[PDB]
C-alpha cells in the first residue's frame, strides 16, 4: 500500500498472507471468510504470461499476522491448502475479468482476537454500499511505492464513478470490476500495489456495523499514479460462484 499507515492490532483479523514455501516469501494477500475458506485473486495463483501456476502444496496460508516477516509465535496460525478453486471464466488472457479464487484449508483455523472472518455482501448491502464517493478500506503487506513495510498497512479510498474508471485506462473494464482511489484534484492519495494482490477491499455497513468484503485487489497501472485508479474484483457479482463452490466441495 502506497500512502497508507500502520494497521492497529486486530484491525483486520480477516487479513490472510499467501506465503510460498520455497523460497520463503510473501506471495499475495487474501482473506478469511470462514474457519476453512480463504478468498484471494486468481492472478495470485494462475498467470501464464508470467509462467505462474501454483499448486496446493507450493503454498502456506498465514493468518492473524501483523508483522510482515516475523514468525508471530502464539499469535499467527499457518495452514495447509487442501484444494484451490479458480473461476472457470477467469480471463487471464485479456483483462483479469473474474479475478477470483477460493482456497480450502486442510483443517479449520482457530478464531481469536487476531483471527476472525469478514462477511460477504448480499445484494442489498452491495446495492447500498457500492456508490461513487463512498469509501472502502484496503490492507496488505505490499510495496510502499512503485520498500516493503514492517507491519500490515491500511488505507481508506473512495469508490470511483464507472465512466471515470473507464476513461482512465485503455484496458477493457467489466461489470465484474470496480475502481477506487482519489482523483488528482482531491489532494489526498493512496493505492494498493504489487504484493497487495488478493487482499480485501472492505466497507463497514452503517446498517449493522459489520465489515463486508466488497472487493479483491486485482490490478492497476503503476501504483498511486495521478489519474490512474486501482481496480478490484466485484465480490458480490461473483457470489453465486462462491456459494456454489462452497456448497459443492464444502
Amino acid at each position: 500500500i502506497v500512502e497508507g499507515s500502520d494497521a492497529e492490532i486486530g484491525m483486520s483479523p480477516w487479513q490472510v498472507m499467501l506465503f510460498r514455501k520455497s523460497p520463503q516469501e510473501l506471495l499475495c494477500g487474501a482473506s478469511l471468510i470462514s474457519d476453512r475458506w480463504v478468498l484471494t485473486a486468481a492472478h495470485c495463483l494462475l498467470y501464464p504470461p508470467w509462467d505462474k501456476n501454483f499448486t496446493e502444496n507450493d503454498l502456506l496460508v498465514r493468518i492473524g499476522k501483523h508483522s510482515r516477516t516475523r514468525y508471530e509465535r502464539n499469535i499467527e496460525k499457518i495452514s495447509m491448502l487442501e484444494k484451490i478453486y479458480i473461476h472457470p471464466r477467469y480471463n487471464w488472457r485479456e483483462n483479469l475479468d473474474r479475478d477470483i479464487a477460493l482456497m480450502k484449508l486442510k483443517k479449520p483455523v482457530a478464531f481469536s482476537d487476531y483471527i476472525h472472518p469478514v462477511c460477504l455482501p448480499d445484494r442489498e448491502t452491495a446495492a447500498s454500499l457500492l456508490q461513487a464517493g463512498y469509501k472502502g478500506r484496503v490492507t496488505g503487506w505490499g510495496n510502499l511505492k512503485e520498500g516493503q513495510p514492517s507491519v500490515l498497512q491500511v488505507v481508506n479510498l473512495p469508490i470511483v464513478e464507472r465512466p471515470v474508471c473507464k476513461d482512465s485506462t485503455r484496458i477493457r473494464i467489466t461489470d465484474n470490476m470496480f475502481c477506487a482511489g482519489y482523483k488528482p484534484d482531491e489532494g489526498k492519495r493512496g493505492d494498493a500495489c504489487e504484493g497487495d494482490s488478493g487482499g480485501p477491499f472492505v466497507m463497514k455497513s452503517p446498517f449493522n456495523n459489520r465489515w463486508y468484503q466488497m472487493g479483491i485487489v486485482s490490478w492497476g497501472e503503476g501504483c498511486d499514479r495521478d489519474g490512474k485508479y486501482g481496480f478490484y474484483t466485484h465480490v458480490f457479482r461473483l457470489k453465486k460462484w462462491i456459494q456454489k463452490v462452497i456448497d459443492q466441495f464444502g
Binding site: 499507515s5 492497529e8 492490532i9 486486530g10 484491525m11 483479523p13 471468510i33 470462514s34 474457519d35 478464531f111 481469536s112 482476537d113 487476531y114 476472525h116 472472518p117 469478514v118 462477511c119 460477504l120 454500499l129 464517493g133 463512498y134 469509501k135 472502502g136 478500506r137 491500511v154 481508506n156 473512495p158 466497507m203 463497514k204 455497513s205 452503517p206 456495523n209 459489520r210 465489515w211 463486508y212
Partner: peptide, 28 residues
C-alpha cells in the same frame, strides 16, 4: 459465521479504530 465482520478487539468491545469514522462520513 453468524459473527462475521465483528472484530474481537473493536466491535465486540465497542471500541472504534482510528479511521473507521472516515468511512462512515462518506456513506452519505
Amino acid at each position: 459465521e453468524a459473527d462475521c465482520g465483528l472484530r474481537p478487539l473493536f466491535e465486540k468491545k465497542s471500541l472504534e479504530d482510528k479511521t473507521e469514522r472516515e468511512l462512515l462520513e462518506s456513506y452519505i
